[PDB]
């Protein structure tokens, strides 16, 4: 059974403007495993991105963690872009520290 991905965007540590942090994008619960995940800076693909191994559980289906180093700023800018066969077009989820 096909499952659209669950996407969670958050920082590793509490966000403080001007201080180095890590922007996380956790994608889980999707099937099949073919997926596209990118971290964005005003829609621009961030190129220095790391990611965990593609893992699978019988309960969570497939999951995957992307993360990059970033420095939060006053403005709203950072987001995650996920593309999947269950999506007609790439889905962008903006980062919100109050969320």
């Amino acid at each position: 059974i096909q499952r659209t991905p669950k996407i969670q965007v958050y920082s590793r540590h509490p966000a403080e403007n001007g201080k180095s942090n890590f922007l996380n994008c956790y994608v889980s619960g999707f099937h099949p495993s073919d997926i596209e995940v990118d971290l964005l800076k005003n829609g621009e693909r961030i190129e220095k991105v790391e990611h965990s191994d593609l893992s699978f559980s019988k309960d969570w289906s497939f999951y995957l963690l992307y993360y990059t180093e970033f420095t939060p700023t006053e403005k709203d800018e950072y987001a995650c872009r996920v593309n999947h066969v269950t999506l007609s077009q790439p889905k962008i989820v903006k980062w919100d520290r109050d969320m």
Partner: antibody, heavy 116, light 107 residues
Framework: QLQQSGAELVKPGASVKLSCTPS????????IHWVKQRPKQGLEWIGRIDPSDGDIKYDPKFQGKATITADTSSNTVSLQLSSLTSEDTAVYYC????????????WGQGTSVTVS | DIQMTQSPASQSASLGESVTITCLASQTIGTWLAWYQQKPGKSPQLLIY???SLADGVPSRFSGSGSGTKFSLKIRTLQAEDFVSYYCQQLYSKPYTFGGGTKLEIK
């Protein structure tokens, strides 16, 4: 709308500065790209600037020739071309980035630069 | 630097016919690909973003397809305004290189 400055006709070896001024939004709101197009030839990506934090990226082959700047006090992004030769004769477009698209959705009319 | 091999370089067709333009990336770029159209006397204009999504105002006879390294631009039922230039562009890794372009000519 992305207003661009008037056409330029200059001698070889001179310098020129093309300006790109948006109407309806601030330069600090998005990325401004610059594209070169020789007469009857294809498109060439030069670089782009984030005027909100001054991040600039260039195509490596344009680093010695082109210099992108921003005057946020005047809501203007500029592209400077120096030591002009015949190969620099082209139309230079400035394009506005749209994050939800992941591409440049609106382009300016372009500034024609003629090197005699 | 990522290379984009756009083919064909030139194509001729008649009104109503269909055309397919292909762009090949030198490495996987996912769906970070845009298609632009350039008409005589105009700036380039966005047709397709994210490989398959139409921009506002673009007619439904324009179709984008592909993922990874091979991408396609399909134009059905060609009218006079469509016989212009088309360029693909990768937005995966800077520099955001363009394709060589394709000029559509009438019969």
């Amino acid at each position: 709308q992305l207003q661009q400055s008037g056409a330029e006709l200059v001698k070889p070896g001179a310098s020129v500065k093309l300006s790109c001024t948006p109407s309806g939004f601030n330069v600090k709101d998005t990325y401004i790209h610059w594209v070169k197009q020789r007469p009857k030839q294809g498109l060439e990506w030069i670089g782009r600037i984030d005027p909100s934090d001054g991040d600039i990226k260039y195509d490596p082959k344009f680093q010695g020739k082109a210099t992108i700047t921003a005057d946020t006090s005047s809501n203007t992004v500029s592209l400077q071309l120096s030591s002009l030769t015949s190969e620099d004769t082209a139309v230079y477009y400035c394009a506005r980035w749209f994050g939800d698209y992941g591409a440049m959705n609106y382009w300016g009319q372009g500034t024609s630069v003629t090197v005699s | 630097d990522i290379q984009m091999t756009q083919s064909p370089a030139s194509q001729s067709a008649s009104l109503g016919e269909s055309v397919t333009i292909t762009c090949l990336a030198s490495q996987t770029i996912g769906t970070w690909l845009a298609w632009y159209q350039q008409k005589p006397g105009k700036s380039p204009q966005l047709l397709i973003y994210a490989a398959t999504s139409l921009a506002d105002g673009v007619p439904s006879r324009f179709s984008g397809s592909g993922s990874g390294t091979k991408f396609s631009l399909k134009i059905r039922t060609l009218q006079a305004e469509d016989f212009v230039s088309y360029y693909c562009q990768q937005l995966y890794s800077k520099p955001y290189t363009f394709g060589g372009g394709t000029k559509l000519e009438i019969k």
